[PDB]
Amino acid sequence: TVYFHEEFKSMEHWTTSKHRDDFGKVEISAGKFYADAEKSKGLRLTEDARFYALSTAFPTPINNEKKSLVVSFSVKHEQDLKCGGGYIKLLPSMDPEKFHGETKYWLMFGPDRCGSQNRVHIILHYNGENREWSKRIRFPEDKLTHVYTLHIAADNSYEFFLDGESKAKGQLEEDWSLLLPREIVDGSGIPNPDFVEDSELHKVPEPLTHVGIDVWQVESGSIFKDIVIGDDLKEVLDLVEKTYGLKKAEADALKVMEDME
Ligand SMILES: [Cl-]
C-alpha cells in the first residue's frame, strides 16, 4: 500500500548525475535550526548558484492501473530563498548518470520560486508533452518545513494538500489541457466529433522507476524529507502526521533563532 518512503537518513543509494561536472553538493543534515536533531535530518542542498541532479530507483516499479497514486514530500527553505526550486520528479526507465532537465518524467511536483514569481508545480507528461497545471497556488514564503501531497485518483480526479490541508481539488481533464475540446465552438452546443475520451488520464503511460531531484538554486540550503508514494490517501496523510505534524517543536526552534536577532 506504501510503495516507497525516502527518509533521507542516508544518501548512498542516491546517484548523482554525470551530465555536468559541476552539479551541487548535497548532504544529510538537520539545518541551522530544527525541531529534532535526528528526526529533522534530510537531504540538504549545500552550494549557492548550482544545478542539482540526483536520483534513486524504486525497489519495485510503480503502477496505478484502476488504483490511486499518492505522492508526498517536504521541503524546508530555511535560507531565505529568493530564486530556487524545491520540486521532485517521478520518472519512467532512465539512466541516473545522464539524468538532467531534459530527461523524460511523468510528474514534476513541488514548490518553485524566483523573484516575485511563485507557484506549486503539478506538471503531467501526457501525449508527448509536459502539461502545466492550470491553477496557480503560491507556497508559503518562510523558513518553515512545508509538505506537498498529491492524490491522483482512478476516476481522473485529483487533490493537492499543503501541510496536510486540502488546497486544490478537481478534475484532471478540466484543470489541465490534456484533451481536445468537447464542443467545436464553445457555447454552441455542437459536439466536436474529433473529441477523444480518455478514462486513463490518471494512469502512468509507462511504469514509474525513479524519483529524482532536478532543481536550480541561487540561495541554497533547502532540505528535502519524507518522499512517500502509495495507493491510499489516508495512509499517506497518517504518515505525514507522524513525520511532519514536529510542527510545534520546529516553530519554537525558529523563534529561538529569531530572538537572537
Ligand atoms: Cl505547473
Residue numbers in the entry: 23 to 211, 294 to 349, 351 to 366
Question: Which passages does the manuscript contain on this structure?
Answer:
Calreticulin (CRT) is a 46 kDa soluble multifunctional protein that was initially identified as an endoplasmic reticulum (ER) chaperone for monoglycosylated proteins and is also involved in Ca2+ regulation. Similar to its ER membrane homologue calnexin (CNX) ectodomain, CRT is composed of a globular domain, into which a flexible arm-like P (proline-rich) domain is inserted. The globular domain is made up of seven concave and six convex β-sheets forming a legume lectin fold. We have investigated the CRTs of two distinct parasites, Trypanosoma cruzi (TcCRT) and Entamoeba histolytica (EhCRT), for which a pathogenic role has been proposed.
Several trials were required to define a suitable TcCRT construct because simultaneously removing these flexible areas drastically reduced the molecular solubility and stability, as checked for example by fluorescent spectroscopy (not shown). The diffraction quality of these crystals was slightly improved by adding a large amount (1 M) of glucose (Glc) to the crystallization droplet. SAXS was used to study the overall shape and flexibility of several TcCRT constructs. The TcCRT SAXS analysis above suggests that the junction domain is stable in the solution structures.
